[PDB]
Amino acid sequence: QVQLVESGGGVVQPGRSLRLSCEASGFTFNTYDMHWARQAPGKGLEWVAVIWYDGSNKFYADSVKGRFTISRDNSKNTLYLQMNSLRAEDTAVYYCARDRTPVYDILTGYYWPPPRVDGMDVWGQGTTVTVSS
Amino acid sequence: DNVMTQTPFSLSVTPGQPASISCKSSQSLLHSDGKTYLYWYLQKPGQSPQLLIYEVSNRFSGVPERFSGSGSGTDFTLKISRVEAEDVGVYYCMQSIQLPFTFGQGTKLEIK
Amino acid sequence: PLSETKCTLKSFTVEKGIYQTSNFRVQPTESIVRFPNITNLCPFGEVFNATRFASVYAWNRKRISNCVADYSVLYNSASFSTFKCYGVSPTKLNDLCFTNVYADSFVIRGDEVRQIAPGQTGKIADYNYKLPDDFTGCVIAWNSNNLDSGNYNYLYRLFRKSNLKPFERDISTEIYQAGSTPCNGVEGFNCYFPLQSYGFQPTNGVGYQPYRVVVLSFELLHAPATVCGPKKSTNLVKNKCVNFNFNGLTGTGVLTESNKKFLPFQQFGRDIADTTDAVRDPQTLEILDITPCSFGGVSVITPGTNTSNQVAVLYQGVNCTEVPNVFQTRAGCLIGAEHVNNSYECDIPIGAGICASYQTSQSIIAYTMSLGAENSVAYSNNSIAIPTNFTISVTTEILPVSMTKTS
Amino acid sequence: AYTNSFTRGVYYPDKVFRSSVLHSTQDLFLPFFSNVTWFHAIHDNPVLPFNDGVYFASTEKSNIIRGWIFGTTLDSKTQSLLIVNNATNVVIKVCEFQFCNDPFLGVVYSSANNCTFEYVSQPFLMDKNLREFVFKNIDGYFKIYSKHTPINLVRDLPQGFSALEPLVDLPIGINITRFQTLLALHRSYLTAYYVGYLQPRTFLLKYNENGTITDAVDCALD
Amino acid sequence: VDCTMYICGDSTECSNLLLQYGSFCTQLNRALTGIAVEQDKNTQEVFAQVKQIYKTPPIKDFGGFNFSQILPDPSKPSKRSFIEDLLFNKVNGLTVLPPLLTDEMIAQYTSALLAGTITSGWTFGAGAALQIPFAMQMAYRFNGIGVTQNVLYENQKLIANQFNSAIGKIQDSLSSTASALGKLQDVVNQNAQALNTLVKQLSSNFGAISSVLNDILSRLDPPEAEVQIDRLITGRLQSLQTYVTQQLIRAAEIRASANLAATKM
Amino acid sequence: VDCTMYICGDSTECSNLLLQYGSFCTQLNRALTGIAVEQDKNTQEVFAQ
Amino acid sequence: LSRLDPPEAEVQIDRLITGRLQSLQTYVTQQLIRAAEIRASANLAATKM
Ligand SMILES: *[C@@H]1O[C@H](CO)[C@@H](O)[C@H](O)[C@H]1NC(C)=O
Ligand SMILES: *[C@@H]1O[C@H](CO)[C@@H](O)[C@H](O)[C@H]1NC(C)=O
Ligand SMILES: *[C@@H]1O[C@H](CO)[C@@H](O)[C@H](O)[C@H]1NC(C)=O
Ligand SMILES: *[C@@H]1O[C@H](CO)[C@@H](O)[C@H](O)[C@H]1NC(C)=O
Ligand SMILES: *[C@@H]1O[C@H](CO)[C@@H](O)[C@H](O)[C@H]1NC(C)=O
Ligand SMILES: *[C@@H]1O[C@H](CO)[C@@H](O)[C@H](O)[C@H]1NC(C)=O
Ligand SMILES: *[C@@H]1O[C@H](CO)[C@@H](O)[C@H](O)[C@H]1NC(C)=O
Ligand SMILES: *[C@@H]1O[C@H](CO)[C@@H](O)[C@H](O)[C@H]1NC(C)=O
Ligand SMILES: *[C@@H]1O[C@H](CO)[C@@H](O)[C@H](O)[C@H]1NC(C)=O
Ligand SMILES: *[C@@H]1O[C@H](CO)[C@@H](O)[C@H](O)[C@H]1NC(C)=O
Ligand SMILES: *[C@@H]1O[C@H](CO)[C@@H](O)[C@H](O)[C@H]1NC(C)=O
Ligand SMILES: *[C@@H]1O[C@H](CO)[C@@H](O)[C@H](O)[C@H]1NC(C)=O
């Protein structure tokens, strides 16, 4: 079964940096793109960021540009999100999520479909990050 | 930005009755490859979201057959043949045609 | 460094100046190996222990890929009388990586196996199976009298219009004609059926008993390595000078996170000079920028052995974080000389407008050049200065005219 | 009929990343401004030679083309390669096909027998736009490159520029001298695209910062 | 160039083989060091002719002449003139050493020469700078070409206007798309071309099985590897010797040009 | 001087072998062309005053 | 090329190419030095003009 286990939550003050972590197991980690998504309390979901399978291409949402740095280490089957420059609105539960589309296996001769980011396949347990005085 | 909406904000459904909950988008979700990129997620009370519909009519593996959906352009909707007790939760529709991925505001499904 | 200057000048005395004595190169701290995570062993068994080998005229080719190919066991096996490798040494095969390895297996008479090599001539090399002149691979042969003997099923092509190109095979069976008549489907005048069997009797003469021969061919130009030796991948390390080995690509440099937009099928990146400067790690699949380990010439600033034995060393174009008074001069960071905020005439040049000198308990100083004494000319629209006196100045000028007439 | 290939059909010669560099390479490219045969297959699909490599292009609103056929005899006597995309998957296999006079797909068709290789994945043809392909068979490797571009020119290839990137790279290693495209039809009455043959040419390729080929020069053109 | 590293870097197997050729690397390094010292000598000889750094006065009362374009620009970080700024904008195993005199120092020398010429003219070359009004200086310079002083004084304004217009025309022509600086761009292009050709020669195999030393050392045993390494050593050594000879010829040409420029100054 | 023709004229085998030495022929052709242009520059600057 | 097969012909052709290329390089170097001398003479001639 597909396993995702978030970590790195807790209570913090505004202005400092924090790190979230997501363990992954039960599937070929390095061939899947990875998403970060969050749900602020009492409000709807919000896609935070996505990282490419090789970590080459990174994208983030408009609310987090310039600030957050998404990274992964395929050797350890881990995913990261550096939470630089917090403000109160970052109070939310955070989920690491898998991409539905893995990249084609290059050992086969076929190189289609082109690797593209797609919606969130499987969502992890989730952890809470609270930032406030 | 591809702003999106869902109506009604909360639908109350007796057990076994069919249910209908809608999603909409500002710009068309049809991509140049011919696919229409819409994803839906179910978040029951007290855990992370679960993917239900990954293309407008394609149900995700492991989803019960009662869940189904259809749509085109900017109007989309999901149909439930009969609502069982575990179907209570919030339904979020989401486009994946362009980044950032934009969710709808979410809609609750409850028992009457 | 003073002794290095004395040694490179081959003199016990050193004049004032700056001398390039040696070259600095930060050494590799660790050795790194990153081979692909292929688990399955390679099916060499069905190549060598096959039930039946094809005739030399119709040699059978097998394609080998996705292997952890152990060539040590083949090399150490006593069965193989001939284990000859041309483009590679047999011992090195356990540490190389190849793409799309071929294995050409066929049976052949004994003493004529010498024709299986680059540039050879003879009936088998000319008309049955020819290797290229730049062949990269191994030719493996052994006695097969106990299996292939009598026996007459195996054949070899005697008659054929022209010498075969490398790695082509002829299957035609029409009656060749050496005479001029149209020998159509008949062995007419000087015409023969092109294939005739080998006489593999169980006790034929030495060199005539059958030999089973397998030829391994390796391709190295193609990017994705599919056949690799049984080396063990080391944990990856970044941001330090290390020896690295990605899929057999030996090298030395600093590995750094890459921003290059490699496509999934791309494994390597090439610089403008057509040298590998980026690589996809074959396990994490991440792209790593390769840069050379920091290096630069080493220059020794010497006030002169007659003056003093103290010296200062300039490591050209390096940052002092890599070198092991210290001063980050723009022309390479300088040690052994103390920076001073004054400015003097250039005694010993270094570069970027900075020079060094031996001055006052004395030590070697480093300073920015003073181009000259400042002077504000008292210009005005109605003021002139006229000399009231003079000095006759005699200045010597030396010019070379000729040099010695060597022959 | 014939038309002029305005610098179309160039592709990435090798799967090695190169960025911000002008690279001179020798490979089987389509010559610039060459004569490409234009086949008005819809009012048929003749078997065409495979001269060291083929450049194939097409543009239809209804994606009539679905695949290709390769081989020497195209019968049970010799090995043949089949590529075809139905509504849900591609299928690539290399078998001694007993091809009929008119290969096509119904509303679905195969002639496979006694063979070794097979493969399945998503279709690269989908349900205005120009689809270009380049086929090669050298050193035991069968290769396909591809690129899809919107257009507005009606009945000729565009003046623009776009490099074809790899789509298939298989070590099939079969002998190929002839090929034939196959179509999808709403009928089974067993009895549109451009073709241009590659030649060995020296090209100078401009790689931009993102690693994509943005322009090229055919050294032997003029 | 590090001769040992260029011919074969990070490979002691070649370095032992390269020793058998003797002192060729020492000769190449010595020649390139001589060329490098010659460049600093050329710059010093051309620009360092002033014994003092003369400053232009704060008041620009030069009798109508306007040297704003050629004099230093105070506002810039590097104190180049306007025309100097226009000029500056329009123009492994091996390393590039920096010049002894930075562009700031050369600009300082040029400013000193300009100030000495404007305020004192010919005199600071002969000895201590003797101030003189610029009108009288240009008057004698008219007298130096056989034109009497009154020819200048009677029409000083026209002369000043003509000089200002000519300087403005130089500024406009230089700021345009004109390629008047092709002579220096030729030097830059020749140096770049020589270095690129030297680097490209590493890709040539010279008859060896491969152009990469690591491939030879990984694939072949020492006795079999040596014959390929010898071919690569001979090829790369020949390429480096050719490069050094070309640089010596170019250095002689540049030395002649620098001597001419020093004489012109 | 045409470097390839001088070293080996009309020989495709030697022409292929000569490519292994790289860009020596292009270098020599460039140098000789530079000398050739330099002669015209000399005559121009002497006589075209 | 008429007497020997490619594997031995290449061995002979390698040393023949090496000799001819060395001769051409020496010729070009001598021409470069002589061109520098002639340029010095031509600059002197232009100055005299
Ligand atoms: C190779 O893949 C296996 C898959 O289970 C994994 O356990 C292992 O860590 C990977 N790496 C190595 C060096 O075996
Ligand atoms: C062939 O059979 C022998 C029998 O002992 C075995 O040792 C060997 O591993 C087999 N395979 C090869 C490639 O020799
Ligand atoms: C050392 O230098 C001093 C001062 O220049 C000089 O008087 C003396 O003769 C020198 N001695 C030698 C051995 O060069
Ligand atoms: C030297 O290295 C340090 C650490 O990498 C860096 O902070 C500093 O800017 C470097 N200085 C120069 C002149 O390169
Ligand atoms: C030299 O200048 C530096 C930088 O202004 C300053 O930090 C230092 O104290 C000065 N030292 C002396 C001895 O003037
Ligand atoms: C000129 O200088 C000399 C010394 O060089 C001095 O003896 C003489 O008196 C001076 N004459 C005048 C007029 O100042
Ligand atoms: C070949 O091309 C020329 C010019 O493009 C054209 O005039 C001619 O008709 C073409 N012929 C064929 C047979 O394609
Ligand atoms: C390839 O097939 C053709 C028939 O189209 C045949 O003439 C040719 O000899 C074959 N070549 C090889 C190498 O099989
Ligand atoms: C497409 O072909 C595959 C076999 O290649 C088959 O399994 C699949 O059902 C086909 N799909 C359609 C829609 O015909
Ligand atoms: C299959 O192909 C092989 C090789 O061409 C042939 O020997 C065999 O008879 C074929 N069998 C059938 C059933 O077609
Ligand atoms: C390269 O990629 C970037 C990022 O996707 C994009 O903004 C840019 O337009 C692309 N092309 C060039 C020429 O930079
Ligand atoms: C000198 O010329 C500059 C333009 O280069 C102009 O701005 C300035 O006013 C002029 N000054 C005088 C005194 O003519």
mmCIF file of C-alpha atoms in Angstrom, chain D:
data_model
loop_
_atom_site.group_PDB
_atom_site.id
_atom_site.type_symbol
_atom_site.label_atom_id
_atom_site.label_comp_id
_atom_site.label_asym_id
_atom_site.label_seq_id
_atom_site.Cartn_x
_atom_site.Cartn_y
_atom_site.Cartn_z
ATOM 1 C CA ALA D 1 2.514 15.608 -56.143
ATOM 2 C CA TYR D 2 5.502 17.217 -54.420
ATOM 3 C CA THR D 3 6.133 20.060 -51.980
ATOM 4 C CA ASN D 4 9.103 21.825 -50.389
ATOM 5 C CA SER D 5 10.335 21.076 -46.854
ATOM 6 C CA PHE D 6 11.195 24.496 -45.429
ATOM 7 C CA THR D 7 13.847 23.415 -42.913
ATOM 8 C CA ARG D 8 11.554 20.806 -41.334
ATOM 9 C CA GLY D 9 12.575 17.408 -40.026
ATOM 10 C CA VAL D 10 15.638 18.220 -37.916
ATOM 11 C CA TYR D 11 15.962 16.235 -34.695
ATOM 12 C CA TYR D 12 18.195 15.771 -31.676
ATOM 13 C CA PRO D 13 21.048 13.575 -33.019
ATOM 14 C CA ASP D 14 21.869 12.063 -29.616
ATOM 15 C CA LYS D 15 20.433 11.878 -26.106
ATOM 16 C CA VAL D 16 23.075 14.117 -24.518
ATOM 17 C CA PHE D 17 22.276 17.484 -22.961
ATOM 18 C CA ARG D 18 23.838 20.546 -24.589
ATOM 19 C CA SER D 19 22.970 24.136 -23.686
ATOM 20 C CA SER D 20 24.059 27.496 -25.111
ATOM 21 C CA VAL D 21 26.377 25.972 -27.712
ATOM 22 C CA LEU D 22 26.572 25.688 -31.492
ATOM 23 C CA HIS D 23 27.232 22.009 -32.222
ATOM 24 C CA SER D 24 28.342 20.689 -35.612
ATOM 25 C CA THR D 25 27.210 17.104 -36.178
ATOM 26 C CA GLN D 26 27.179 14.500 -38.948
ATOM 27 C CA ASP D 27 24.047 12.354 -39.108
ATOM 28 C CA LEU D 28 21.216 11.295 -41.415
ATOM 29 C CA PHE D 29 19.199 14.512 -41.639
ATOM 30 C CA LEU D 30 16.527 15.578 -44.090
ATOM 31 C CA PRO D 31 18.151 18.127 -46.457
ATOM 32 C CA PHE D 32 16.749 21.635 -46.219
ATOM 33 C CA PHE D 33 14.373 22.672 -49.010
ATOM 34 C CA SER D 34 14.192 19.107 -50.324
ATOM 35 C CA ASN D 35 11.380 17.563 -52.366
ATOM 36 C CA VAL D 36 8.947 15.767 -50.054
ATOM 37 C CA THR D 37 6.415 13.494 -51.726
ATOM 38 C CA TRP D 38 2.847 14.502 -50.842
ATOM 39 C CA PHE D 39 0.405 11.579 -50.882
ATOM 40 C CA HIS D 40 -3.314 12.308 -51.267
ATOM 41 C CA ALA D 41 -4.267 8.953 -49.762
ATOM 42 C CA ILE D 42 -7.930 9.978 -49.256
ATOM 43 C CA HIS D 43 -9.889 10.897 -52.384
ATOM 44 C CA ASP D 44 -4.415 5.054 -51.098
ATOM 45 C CA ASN D 45 -1.411 3.975 -48.994
ATOM 46 C CA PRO D 46 1.354 2.544 -51.222
ATOM 47 C CA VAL D 47 4.305 0.630 -49.840
ATOM 48 C CA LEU D 48 7.263 3.024 -49.891
ATOM 49 C CA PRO D 49 11.030 2.362 -49.765
ATOM 50 C CA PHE D 50 12.995 2.949 -46.563
ATOM 51 C CA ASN D 51 16.083 4.780 -47.823
ATOM 52 C CA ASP D 52 18.282 4.820 -44.689
ATOM 53 C CA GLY D 53 15.612 6.796 -42.824
ATOM 54 C CA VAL D 54 12.272 8.468 -43.418
ATOM 55 C CA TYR D 55 10.758 11.808 -42.464
ATOM 56 C CA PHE D 56 6.989 11.435 -42.067
ATOM 57 C CA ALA D 57 4.567 14.311 -41.530
ATOM 58 C CA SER D 58 0.796 14.673 -41.583
ATOM 59 C CA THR D 59 -2.015 17.013 -40.558
ATOM 60 C CA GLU D 60 -5.692 16.059 -40.325
ATOM 61 C CA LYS D 61 -8.603 17.200 -38.190
ATOM 62 C CA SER D 62 -9.762 13.598 -37.548
ATOM 63 C CA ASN D 63 -6.424 11.731 -36.968
ATOM 64 C CA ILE D 64 -7.008 9.171 -39.714
ATOM 65 C CA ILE D 65 -3.423 7.894 -39.480
ATOM 66 C CA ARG D 66 -2.821 5.560 -36.528
ATOM 67 C CA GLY D 67 0.400 3.626 -37.115
ATOM 68 C CA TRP D 68 3.066 2.282 -39.432
ATOM 69 C CA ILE D 69 4.371 -1.027 -40.774
ATOM 70 C CA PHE D 70 8.032 -1.868 -41.407
ATOM 71 C CA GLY D 71 9.953 -4.779 -42.880
ATOM 72 C CA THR D 72 11.349 -6.152 -46.152
ATOM 73 C CA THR D 73 8.730 -8.565 -47.559
ATOM 74 C CA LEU D 74 5.863 -7.655 -45.187
ATOM 75 C CA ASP D 75 4.786 -11.315 -45.146
ATOM 76 C CA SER D 76 5.375 -14.423 -43.041
ATOM 77 C CA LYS D 77 8.749 -15.061 -44.709
ATOM 78 C CA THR D 78 10.578 -12.219 -42.909
ATOM 79 C CA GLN D 79 10.364 -10.436 -39.576
ATOM 80 C CA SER D 80 8.271 -7.253 -39.610
ATOM 81 C CA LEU D 81 7.659 -4.458 -37.096
ATOM 82 C CA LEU D 82 4.198 -3.080 -36.295
ATOM 83 C CA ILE D 83 3.292 0.171 -34.537
ATOM 84 C CA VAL D 84 -0.342 1.212 -34.125
ATOM 85 C CA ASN D 85 -2.371 3.322 -31.698
ATOM 86 C CA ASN D 86 -6.006 2.555 -30.939
ATOM 87 C CA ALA D 87 -8.327 4.697 -28.829
ATOM 88 C CA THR D 88 -6.616 3.737 -25.530
ATOM 89 C CA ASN D 89 -3.136 2.244 -26.090
ATOM 90 C CA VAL D 90 -0.203 1.871 -28.446
ATOM 91 C CA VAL D 91 1.043 -1.605 -29.335
ATOM 92 C CA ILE D 92 4.570 -2.244 -30.621
ATOM 93 C CA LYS D 93 5.516 -5.766 -31.661
ATOM 94 C CA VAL D 94 7.945 -7.392 -34.085
ATOM 95 C CA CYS D 95 6.396 -10.445 -35.745
ATOM 96 C CA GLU D 96 6.255 -12.326 -39.041
ATOM 97 C CA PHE D 97 3.047 -10.551 -39.971
ATOM 98 C CA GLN D 98 1.009 -11.804 -42.923
ATOM 99 C CA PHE D 99 -0.074 -8.332 -43.960
ATOM 100 C CA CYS D 100 -3.017 -8.073 -46.336
ATOM 101 C CA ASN D 101 -3.195 -5.847 -49.412
ATOM 102 C CA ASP D 102 -4.909 -3.018 -47.476
ATOM 103 C CA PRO D 103 -3.909 -2.812 -43.798
ATOM 104 C CA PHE D 104 -6.217 -0.662 -41.676
ATOM 105 C CA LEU D 105 -8.317 -0.612 -38.502
ATOM 106 C CA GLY D 106 -12.091 -0.906 -38.279
ATOM 107 C CA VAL D 107 -14.546 0.790 -35.922
ATOM 108 C CA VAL D 108 -9.436 -4.283 -34.478
ATOM 109 C CA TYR D 109 -6.957 -5.774 -36.973
ATOM 110 C CA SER D 110 -3.816 -7.883 -36.669
ATOM 111 C CA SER D 111 -1.878 -10.570 -38.540
ATOM 112 C CA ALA D 112 0.733 -11.578 -35.955
ATOM 113 C CA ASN D 113 2.368 -14.998 -35.780
ATOM 114 C CA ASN D 114 5.377 -16.791 -34.351
ATOM 115 C CA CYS D 115 7.423 -13.976 -32.818
ATOM 116 C CA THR D 116 9.436 -12.556 -29.946
ATOM 117 C CA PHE D 117 8.810 -8.886 -29.036
ATOM 118 C CA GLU D 118 5.744 -6.993 -27.837
ATOM 119 C CA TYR D 119 5.062 -3.798 -25.897
ATOM 120 C CA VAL D 120 2.079 -1.685 -24.817
ATOM 121 C CA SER D 121 1.684 1.831 -23.392
ATOM 122 C CA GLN D 122 -0.352 5.024 -23.849
ATOM 123 C CA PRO D 123 -0.916 6.222 -27.439
ATOM 124 C CA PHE D 124 1.253 8.986 -28.863
ATOM 125 C CA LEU D 125 -1.481 9.759 -31.400
ATOM 126 C CA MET D 126 -4.577 11.422 -29.953
ATOM 127 C CA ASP D 127 -8.210 11.926 -30.906
ATOM 128 C CA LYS D 128 -5.124 22.491 -36.971
ATOM 129 C CA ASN D 129 -2.089 20.567 -35.710
ATOM 130 C CA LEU D 130 0.897 19.107 -37.561
ATOM 131 C CA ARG D 131 2.343 15.751 -36.491
ATOM 132 C CA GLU D 132 5.919 15.115 -37.648
ATOM 133 C CA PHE D 133 7.964 11.932 -37.338
ATOM 134 C CA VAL D 134 11.453 10.766 -38.297
ATOM 135 C CA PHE D 135 12.335 7.064 -38.528
ATOM 136 C CA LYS D 136 15.826 5.558 -38.395
ATOM 137 C CA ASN D 137 17.235 2.022 -38.281
ATOM 138 C CA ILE D 138 21.005 1.914 -37.724
ATOM 139 C CA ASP D 139 23.443 0.000 -35.509
ATOM 140 C CA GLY D 140 20.692 -2.430 -34.540
ATOM 141 C CA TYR D 141 18.526 0.345 -33.045
ATOM 142 C CA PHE D 142 15.133 1.372 -34.415
ATOM 143 C CA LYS D 143 14.372 4.975 -33.461
ATOM 144 C CA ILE D 144 11.427 7.356 -33.811
ATOM 145 C CA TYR D 145 11.505 11.093 -33.129
ATOM 146 C CA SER D 146 8.390 13.248 -32.992
ATOM 147 C CA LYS D 147 7.044 16.754 -32.485
ATOM 148 C CA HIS D 148 3.529 18.216 -32.511
ATOM 149 C CA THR D 149 2.882 21.856 -33.460
ATOM 150 C CA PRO D 150 -0.261 23.910 -34.162
ATOM 151 C CA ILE D 151 -0.442 25.407 -37.657
ATOM 152 C CA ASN D 152 -2.718 27.526 -39.834
ATOM 153 C CA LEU D 153 -1.215 27.034 -43.316
ATOM 154 C CA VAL D 154 -3.681 24.864 -45.201
ATOM 155 C CA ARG D 155 -1.997 22.688 -47.844
ATOM 156 C CA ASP D 156 1.760 22.957 -47.268
ATOM 157 C CA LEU D 157 4.317 22.520 -44.518
ATOM 158 C CA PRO D 158 4.975 25.608 -42.358
ATOM 159 C CA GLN D 159 7.935 27.942 -42.720
ATOM 160 C CA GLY D 160 8.668 27.743 -38.989
ATOM 161 C CA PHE D 161 11.288 25.723 -37.140
ATOM 162 C CA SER D 162 10.921 22.994 -34.518
ATOM 163 C CA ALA D 163 13.255 20.128 -33.657
ATOM 164 C CA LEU D 164 11.950 16.581 -33.304
ATOM 165 C CA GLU D 165 12.696 14.877 -29.984
ATOM 166 C CA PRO D 166 12.988 11.108 -29.368
ATOM 167 C CA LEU D 167 9.809 9.048 -29.014
ATOM 168 C CA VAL D 168 10.989 5.444 -29.517
ATOM 169 C CA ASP D 169 14.436 3.886 -29.108
ATOM 170 C CA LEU D 170 14.351 0.083 -29.324
ATOM 171 C CA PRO D 171 17.206 -2.413 -30.084
ATOM 172 C CA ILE D 172 15.030 -4.397 -32.489
ATOM 173 C CA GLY D 173 17.830 -5.025 -34.982
ATOM 174 C CA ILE D 174 15.688 -6.241 -37.903
ATOM 175 C CA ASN D 175 16.360 -5.583 -41.578
ATOM 176 C CA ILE D 176 14.094 -2.819 -42.935
ATOM 177 C CA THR D 177 13.844 -1.674 -46.558
ATOM 178 C CA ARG D 178 10.124 -0.907 -47.085
ATOM 179 C CA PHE D 179 7.337 0.526 -44.952
ATOM 180 C CA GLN D 180 3.652 1.387 -45.157
ATOM 181 C CA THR D 181 1.312 3.540 -43.103
ATOM 182 C CA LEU D 182 -2.059 2.261 -41.895
ATOM 183 C CA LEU D 183 -5.322 4.116 -41.338
ATOM 184 C CA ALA D 184 -8.496 3.899 -39.265
ATOM 185 C CA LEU D 185 -11.721 3.474 -41.240
ATOM 186 C CA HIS D 186 -15.432 3.100 -40.501
ATOM 187 C CA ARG D 187 -15.628 0.257 -43.048
ATOM 188 C CA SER D 188 -13.985 -3.089 -43.825
ATOM 189 C CA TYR D 189 -13.834 -3.146 -47.646
ATOM 190 C CA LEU D 190 -10.633 -5.153 -47.993
ATOM 191 C CA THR D 191 -9.688 -5.567 -51.655
ATOM 192 C CA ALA D 192 -2.945 13.352 -46.411
ATOM 193 C CA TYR D 193 0.691 12.923 -45.378
ATOM 194 C CA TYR D 194 4.167 13.893 -46.571
ATOM 195 C CA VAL D 195 7.243 11.684 -46.964
ATOM 196 C CA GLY D 196 10.909 12.595 -47.302
ATOM 197 C CA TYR D 197 14.032 10.441 -47.141
ATOM 198 C CA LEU D 198 17.000 11.268 -44.937
ATOM 199 C CA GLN D 199 20.533 11.626 -46.295
ATOM 200 C CA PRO D 200 23.963 11.892 -44.636
ATOM 201 C CA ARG D 201 24.469 15.625 -44.078
ATOM 202 C CA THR D 202 26.579 17.869 -41.851
ATOM 203 C CA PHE D 203 24.402 20.151 -39.713
ATOM 204 C CA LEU D 204 25.215 22.963 -37.288
ATOM 205 C CA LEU D 205 22.775 22.944 -34.357
ATOM 206 C CA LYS D 206 22.070 25.917 -32.080
ATOM 207 C CA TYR D 207 21.257 24.769 -28.539
ATOM 208 C CA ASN D 208 19.651 27.479 -26.414
ATOM 209 C CA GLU D 209 19.943 27.862 -22.642
ATOM 210 C CA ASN D 210 17.112 25.379 -22.004
ATOM 211 C CA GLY D 211 18.803 22.666 -24.077
ATOM 212 C CA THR D 212 16.339 22.818 -26.978
ATOM 213 C CA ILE D 213 17.424 23.178 -30.596
ATOM 214 C CA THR D 214 16.142 26.551 -31.824
ATOM 215 C CA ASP D 215 17.840 26.834 -35.234
ATOM 216 C CA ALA D 216 20.038 24.870 -37.616
ATOM 217 C CA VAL D 217 22.131 25.203 -40.778
ATOM 218 C CA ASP D 218 22.426 22.636 -43.577
ATOM 219 C CA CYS D 219 26.092 23.000 -44.490
ATOM 220 C CA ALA D 220 25.775 21.490 -47.983
ATOM 221 C CA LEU D 221 22.701 23.527 -48.980
ATOM 222 C CA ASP D 222 24.431 26.555 -50.510
#
